[PDB]
Scaffold this active site. Structure first.
Site, PDB file in Angstrom:
ATOM      1  N   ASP A  25      42.961  35.542  45.320  1.00 12.51           N
ATOM      2  CA  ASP A  25      43.093  34.206  45.378  1.00 12.51           C
ATOM      3  C   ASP A  25      44.600  33.915  46.138  1.00 12.51           C
ATOM      4  O   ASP A  25      45.580  33.969  45.715  1.00 12.51           O
ATOM      5  CB  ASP A  25      43.359  34.005  43.746  1.00 12.51           C
ATOM      6  CG  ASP A  25      43.625  32.559  43.440  1.00 12.51           C
ATOM      7  OD1 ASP A  25      43.579  31.785  44.331  1.00 12.51           O
ATOM      8  OD2 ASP A  25      43.659  32.427  42.293  1.00 12.51           O
ATOM      9  N   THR A  26      44.094  33.043  47.244  1.00 13.28           N
ATOM     10  CA  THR A  26      45.263  32.719  48.133  1.00 13.28           C
ATOM     11  C   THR A  26      46.114  31.482  47.508  1.00 13.28           C
ATOM     12  O   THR A  26      47.334  31.304  47.728  1.00 13.28           O
ATOM     13  CB  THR A  26      44.849  32.091  49.536  1.00 13.28           C
ATOM     14  OG1 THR A  26      44.073  31.069  49.409  1.00 13.28           O
ATOM     15  CG2 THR A  26      44.343  33.027  50.366  1.00 13.28           C
ATOM     16  N   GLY A  27      45.738  31.002  46.305  1.00 14.84           N
ATOM     17  CA  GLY A  27      46.407  29.953  45.514  1.00 14.84           C
ATOM     18  C   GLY A  27      46.834  30.489  44.516  1.00 14.84           C
ATOM     19  O   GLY A  27      47.677  29.550  43.546  1.00 14.84           O
TER      20      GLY A  27
END
Ligand SMILES: CCCC[C@@H](CN[C@@H](CCCC)C(=O)N[C@@H](CCC(N)=O)C(=O)N[C@@H](CCCNC(N)=[NH2+])C(N)=O)NC(=O)[C@@H](NC(=O)[C@@H](NC(C)=O)[C@@H](C)O)[C@@H](C)CC
EC number: 3.4.23.16
Lengths: 99, 99
Positions: A25-27
């Site tokens: 998850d880059t967020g």
């Protein structure tokens, strides 16, 4: 590897000796894993998401393998909808977003 | 380009004639933009993650430019704390996770 996004970027992780599935998850600033037993001391922490804030157990310097890649960092354990590997560990495995 | 993850992967987007900073979120199925008076037909939707759910308005076939990259798809508008570019659009601009 290079991972496209037509499907959720799910990978197998190994934490506390147990295999689990997690979402790259880059967020996510941090790594949040579903409630589980994890060896070591922890401190109460609060994190936020799209719907609000939840309380989690903050475990520091946890050894965790992500898709065959070793990382040693903070792992927050709590009632997250999904296990997510956040930027704190993504940076450790040298993950980048490209387009 | 290549976006490292030391910091939140924020990029400039263009939607509904407005420029905004949005978070490239590989852990989001859909795209959620901060509350804005967007014209057009919409459908109520409920989306969730950490903390719970939020009510949004689903707009279909909305043109959005992500870091200079054009895409056309579904955009959910509601009380999100951050503008989120999900996989529905990340795949359109050819974004990949690499490590
Ligand atoms: C847990 C669910 C899977 C991952 C999650 C990550 N979302 C990002 C969105 C950014 C915030 C709105 C997030 O929650 N990030 C958190 C992860 C937790 C963490 N600690 O890293 C974060 O970075 N939180 C920061 C908040 C920083 C706020 N900024 C600031 N104060 N300046 C934090 N440290 O608490 N995905 C989602 O929230 C999306 N949900 C989904 O993709 C799916 N829903 C579910 C429930 O899985 C799908 C079925 O809808 C939302 C956006 C709908 C499309």
């Amino acid at each position: 590897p290079q991972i496209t996004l037509w499907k959720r970027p799910l990978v197998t992780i190994k934490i506390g000796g147990q295999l689990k599935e997690a979402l790259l998850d880059t967020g996510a600033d941090d790594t949040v894993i579903e409630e589980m037993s994890l060896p070591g001391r922890w401190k109460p922490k609060m994190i936020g998401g799209i719907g609000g804030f939840i309380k989690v157990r903050q475990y520091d310097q946890i050894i965790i393998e992500i898709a065959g890649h070793k990382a040693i960092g903070t792992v927050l354990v709590g009632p997250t909808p999904v296990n997510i590997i956040g930027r704190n560990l993504l940076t450790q495995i040298g993950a980048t977003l490209n387009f």
